[PDB]
Write a protein that binds this ligand. Sequence first.
Ligand SMILES: Nc1ncnc2c1ncn2[C@@H]1O[C@H](COP(=O)(O)OP(=O)(O)OP(=O)(O)O)[C@@H](O)[C@H]1O
Ligand SMILES: [Mn+2]
Ligand SMILES: [Mn+2]
Length: 531
Amino acid sequence: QELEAYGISDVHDIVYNPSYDLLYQEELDPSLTGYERGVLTNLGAVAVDTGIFTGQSPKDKYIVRDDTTRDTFWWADKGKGKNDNKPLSPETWQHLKGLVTRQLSGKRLFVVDAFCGANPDTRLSVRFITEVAWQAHFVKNMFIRPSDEELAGFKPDFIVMNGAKCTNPQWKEQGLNSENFVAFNLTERMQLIGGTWYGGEMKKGMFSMMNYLLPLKGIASMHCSANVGEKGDVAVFFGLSGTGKTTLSTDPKRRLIGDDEHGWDDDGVFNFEGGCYAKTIKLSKEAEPEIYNAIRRDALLENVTVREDGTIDFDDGSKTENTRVSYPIYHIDNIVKPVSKAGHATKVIFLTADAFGVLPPVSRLTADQTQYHFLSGFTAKLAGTERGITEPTPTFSACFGAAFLSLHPTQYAEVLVKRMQAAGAQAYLVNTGWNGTGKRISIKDTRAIIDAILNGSLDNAETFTLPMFNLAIPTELPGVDTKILDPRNTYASPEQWQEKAETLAKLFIDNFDKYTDTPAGAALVAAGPKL
Ligand SMILES: Nc1ncnc2c1ncn2[C@@H]1O[C@H](COP(=O)(O)OP(=O)(O)OP(=O)(O)O)[C@@H](O)[C@H]1O
Ligand SMILES: [Mn+2]
Ligand SMILES: [Mn+2]
């Protein structure tokens, strides 16, 4: 009846609000075939393969262009910086909606109702529809699980229909990138998924919608982790994928607010999600004990290698480097509860994994440097590794998450700065990546830096200015190996560091030029690196 209103017909079996026990038994059903199948690991958690897609597909992301979105969305084709917000006609949207609704017609469907956003005043009431048990599990893990009371009066104001099993044969004619699609309609308030089974598309899809609606009513919407000390002091950690937001916010000395998506309104910082989505490549029990410990029944492992005897080879990246596990946030012992939110952040930390080996492990940023490095959104990676090559490859992703921005970067920078100023927050840049050794800084050294930021040690330290990037760096910090604080010390000579710094400075300078078409942007150039 109600499923019909969405266009899904002849649904025989409806599993509304599936329990964790039911999801466990659905995933291990021995008659499942293909990518629906789960296998039980010795840690008690079920592991699945997500299919050919093992990460987001930005090239398949489309947003319907209509009178509601025309003048507010950050469109990929309106010459305002590179992004993945590709415009979609309403007519083609109706075609994709027919593909997905027909695929889900005549099937057994899982329907998960959940919240995106910790606060009733700004949260989305999302209804997720799928025919794959582990997809419903993923959304039960990653979104906010309502109370029985909230379920009774649940009134969806966004529908996500996951049609991973269907594809679009009309895509060439329609000007699309492939037979797969991840599409959003703000008029009908719906997300459609076709071709990719990857659960991340639903998580980041609703993130992108929050990123669109929250700043339009004065609320920051942020790609960050967040935690809070006993005294109520809040830290947020920005950064691109793989830079350490989840690894480093899971800190037994802090209460976890969230690991990936947060808003910032008049009362403080608040988590969007009900779970965490940790990377498991090379996962070390000794280095990341709380994340490791979260891997138990009700956690959902993705694309890991599971041996015949049920043990996991966390080292094996053969399916993908992006091996993951999701778990409800209460699989972490020390968290904020029952509501994932706290006060205003006073520490704002930009994580970056600098494969060029130039940036210092830690530096406290000026106000202009904060805006400069927020708009720049830099990280890099050794792309040549499988070829035995050191191909440092830069990524500049505005606000440390341009793939999920629905508005222009400046709109996120503006509201972040307003929130920071009102709170007297301070910002820091942390290289969680490489130095002159050609190896990453150890997790142990990085946690000690984060400690030094949070407890005021770094603020009381004697500092000097790193040349070129003009970053204030400490001579020493409690519990941190002193040699690494100056990035020049791990090369044969400061001159060898300088050669790489000049290379990276020019990358930053070229990237930043697109923000200088305003007076404020051009004024920020002086805060960036100077040859
Ligand atoms: N010094 C370090 N600091 C943080 N992480 C490190 C360090 N050295 C290695 N790592 C590894 O880098 C990865 C950090 O990934 P993490 O899951 O924290 O990324 P993220 O910022 O949460 O990304 P996403 O937004 O995609 O979820 C982990 O695999 C971690 O084990
Ligand atoms: Mn993460
Ligand atoms: Mn993320």
